[PDB]
Scaffold this motif. Structure first.
Motif, PDB file in Angstrom:
ATOM      1  N   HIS A 106       0.527  -1.402  -0.138  1.00  0.00           N
ATOM      2  CA  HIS A 106       0.085   0.316   0.195  1.00  0.00           C
ATOM      3  C   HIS A 106       0.610   1.080   0.170  1.00  0.00           C
ATOM      4  O   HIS A 106       0.124   2.341  -0.431  1.00  0.00           O
ATOM      5  CB  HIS A 106      -0.635   0.157   1.708  1.00  0.00           C
ATOM      6  CG  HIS A 106      -1.803   1.489   1.226  1.00  0.00           C
ATOM      7  ND1 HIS A 106      -3.196   0.768   0.934  1.00  0.00           N
ATOM      8  CD2 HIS A 106      -1.416   2.115   1.384  1.00  0.00           C
ATOM      9  CE1 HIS A 106      -3.764   1.792   0.543  1.00  0.00           C
ATOM     10  NE2 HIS A 106      -2.980   3.122   0.962  1.00  0.00           N
ATOM     11  N   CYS A 134      -3.966   1.055  -4.680  1.00  0.00           N
ATOM     12  CA  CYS A 134      -4.149   1.269  -3.083  1.00  0.00           C
ATOM     13  C   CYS A 134      -6.007   1.024  -2.755  1.00  0.00           C
ATOM     14  O   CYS A 134      -6.161   0.374  -1.224  1.00  0.00           O
ATOM     15  CB  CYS A 134      -4.434   2.940  -2.537  1.00  0.00           C
ATOM     16  SG  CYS A 134      -2.522   3.234  -2.534  1.00  0.00           S
ATOM     17  N   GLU A 178      -7.216  -2.182   0.369  1.00  0.00           N
ATOM     18  CA  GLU A 178      -8.369  -1.302   1.089  1.00  0.00           C
ATOM     19  C   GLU A 178      -9.605  -1.921   0.810  1.00  0.00           C
ATOM     20  O   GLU A 178      -9.990  -2.108   1.865  1.00  0.00           O
ATOM     21  CB  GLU A 178      -8.690   0.305   0.995  1.00  0.00           C
ATOM     22  CG  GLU A 178      -7.259   0.548   1.290  1.00  0.00           C
ATOM     23  CD  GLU A 178      -7.435   2.234   1.144  1.00  0.00           C
ATOM     24  OE1 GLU A 178      -8.478   2.576   0.639  1.00  0.00           O
ATOM     25  OE2 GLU A 178      -6.436   2.979   0.858  1.00  0.00           O
TER      26      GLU A 178
HETATM   27 RU   LIG Z   1      -4.708   4.789   0.140  1.00  0.00          RU
END
Ligand SMILES: [Ru+3]
Ligand SMILES: [Ru+3]
Ligand SMILES: [Ru+3]
Ligand SMILES: [Ru+3]
Ligand SMILES: [Ru+3]
Ligand SMILES: [Ru+3]
Ligand SMILES: [Ru+3]
Ligand SMILES: [Ru+3]
Lengths: 173, 173, 173, 173
Positions: D114, D126, D130
């Motif tokens: 990340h 990212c 997530e």
């Molecule tokens: Ru992020």
């Protein structure tokens, strides 16, 4: 004569008969209010239905009192029902004020009867009132208070418009 | 002590505990607002229900924060909840302005916590906020803004009439 | 100002507001207890759910009190909610002892308010308490007493084993 | 060669391939753990099923990574999967400690990837992490932490009894 009566004072028996009269009289008052709002020159159906529903509730209150009187071995005694205080009830606001005045008088009569039964150590009476009348009356008075506030908010500048909108948008019809 | 904590700074842990307090405090404020609109002399049920629903949402926000704190191996610490800023909330307009002020403060606290987690390279935190708080708050603020505009449009000449109509025709009850 | 208030003393109104605070404070205490048992290093889900359910029940108690206050034409006044007495609650036994202590204090507050309403001849108040709080509280305290006895029976020689078995076999999760 | 690749650095592509290897290797480790608990002389079916379910989850993690790599126009490159670190995994406690160690290493690899994607301004990467890995991993680690605490609570005086009860009363079988 009763073979069942127990712990049921003559004072409570009489006050129960008085309260029956007060409820029947409230029912009559509500019948007059309801039909006034059904007049062609008043014509507020939601207000009409609200009072008609109250007339029925007050009658049911009296019937429950009468049932209890017999359950306790008391003797129902009926008096004249006095005609309602007005033949014409004014605006929805005048009427709702009148209704709150009436309910406060019935509530004080319940409270007075409760204090009597408490003084006479009659817990059945006290609980009957608590269980079927006291909270019902508090709830009804709060609802009338709520309505009255909304009616009052709406009088402001154009009373007719307010009176129509209240009946259309708050009251059930 | 935690055997799971990983990438979870003391700074974020503390700020999470602060944000829990802010949400519980917002919940309390909404509880007070809701019951003010249930007063007999205010009597705007749709406004009452709107605030009561917000109190529940804010409480759920705090609970989710608490769950996350434990998921990360942080330790929940509770402080006093300060009483709401007012005992009486004025008109629906005053109340909705107050609610938007409160929501903007919660939103800035979310944004501040997000900037902290970004500075601390804590993507789980950032995503938790993004996924459960940031859009929910933007959506709620837009809804309050919408209401406020409609309330304002309606004050014009007869404020009581406007206030009744808003509650009857926009708010759920 | 209220147009409905009747037989509702300033003393009862104030004590109702105090009792609301006591219930909200009990709710907060239960929220802290529940999340402590959700910690990774405590991890007793049935104990967690038991306290979380209590937090919700106490909040509902406060809401009912608030509703009643308005029904009577009283005015809700909120104070700060004091943080719970502990940040860490020890064993399931320590926690259940703490919960019984808290419930006994709420019960004595109900009993004190009931004695006040009886002294003020406020049968609606007395019946509200009787009907929604007094028996609910007796029932909850009996349940906590039952749990406490079973927890105590299980500490004997191997406390960890007892604590696990209680949570698994008595508490709902 | 890819006609679609855009904003997808060689560094991220390589680190994705490494993370695939780490997930497949975690899957293999879990396969070994699961079958160890299915041995006749170990015979803890709930522990067996817990690890077997983890092997499948880790494999699915790798497959999703591979899908993404292709979605981005990256090229999957596979390396040897190293055998698990142990042939025999000891007690349920040793095994759950080993599993938490492994999950913390996978979590740090996610966090490292990340930080790379954030440095390379690769928001798709990212967000993929997530949305499908970071919270799933936090949730799994919390669950393992919870188990570990309960296992530890139960060792106390009679480890065999504790180990049986944990498997029977917490783990699914
Ligand atoms: Ru992020
Ligand atoms: Ru009584
Ligand atoms: Ru009955
Ligand atoms: Ru972010
Ligand atoms: Ru989530
Ligand atoms: Ru009593
Ligand atoms: Ru009730
Ligand atoms: Ru996806």
């Amino acid at each position: 004569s009763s073979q069942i009566r127990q712990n049921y004072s003559t004072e409570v028996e009489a006050a129960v008969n008085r309260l029956v009269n007060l409820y029947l009289r409230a029912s009559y008052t509500y019948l007059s209010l309801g039909f006034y709002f059904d007049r062609d020159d008043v014509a507020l159906e939601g207000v009409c239905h609200f009072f008609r529903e109250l007339a029925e509730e007050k009658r049911e209150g009296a019937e429950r009192l009468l049932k209890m009187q017999n359950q306790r071995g008391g003797r129902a005694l009926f008096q004249d029902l006095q005609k309602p205080s007005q033949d014409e009830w004014g605006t929805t606001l005048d009427a709702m004020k009148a209704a709150i005045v009436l309910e406060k008088s019935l509530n004080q009569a319940l409270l007075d009867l409760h204090a009597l039964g408490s003084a006479q150590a009659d817990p059945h009476l006290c609980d009957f009132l608590e269980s079927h009348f006291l909270d019902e009356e508090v709830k009804l008075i709060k609802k009338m208070g709520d309505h009255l506030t909304n009616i009052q908010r709406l009088v402001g500048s154009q009373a007719g418009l307010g009176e129509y909108l209240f009946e259309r948008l708050t009251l059930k019809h």
